[PDB]
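okkk here we go again. third time trying to get the calcium ion bound version out, last two times i messed up the smiles copy paste (missing a bracket lol). double checked this time i swear
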Amino acid sequence: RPDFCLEPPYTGPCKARIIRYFYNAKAGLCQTFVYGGCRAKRNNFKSAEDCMRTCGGA
Amino acid sequence: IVGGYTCGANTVPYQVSLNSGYHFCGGSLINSQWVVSAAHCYKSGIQVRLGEDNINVVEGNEQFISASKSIVHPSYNSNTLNNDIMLIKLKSAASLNSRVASISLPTSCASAGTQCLISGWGNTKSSGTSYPDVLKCLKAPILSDSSCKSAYPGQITSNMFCAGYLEGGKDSCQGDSGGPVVCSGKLQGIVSWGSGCAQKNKPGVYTKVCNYVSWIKQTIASN
Ligand SMILES: [Ca+2]
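finally!!
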């Protein structure tokens, strides 16, 4: 539901390739994206289930 | 690595892949049981892969060993990225041969315009996405502190340096994190962070390994 769930996914300035989830309000689901391993925003979940419980409904 | 070249199989024998189901980060083999990597690569359930070239197919020189311990620098700051260094102890000792070999810690710090090799399996597009199968390499000079600090105002600490080309096109990128910057056979850097990849006026930022050598050796010996 909440407003950070509408924000676009943020890879950030660190250079790991770590697969995380973000709420895609356009699709109405949680997708994967590459997170660089630092300075995460709040639309950034470690599993689709966490992502769905927080955001699903935004 | 954007703008690099295929190293050629097993020719960077101290390069490791960190695996959590997939390749997420690089690292350097410092002896038979210790690897050094970046603190932002810290995960649980790491497996280290040694002797990789094509990380996607088993070619028969591999050793896959689990980590026993992962020790992120006690002063790592996840906001400022300062002290972006971590050590990983292998569950068991690798065997060291010609495809798998460790890299020497430096005795001193490298100067501006020393030429280094940065290697990794990270994205090869500056804007775009394309992860290679084989290991990629790039020669890039160390930059001056002063120009590093002008590239990134008020973000460079005494533990970072900048390496690369102010013109853009050659850099390390997502995937490369925790891998080596090796300059005249010594381990000077760890791939750490940047503003995107291979952007003009925004060279990559590396952990300055020469500052940590005393911390590494004593931490290796006492764990
Ligand atoms: Ca392989």
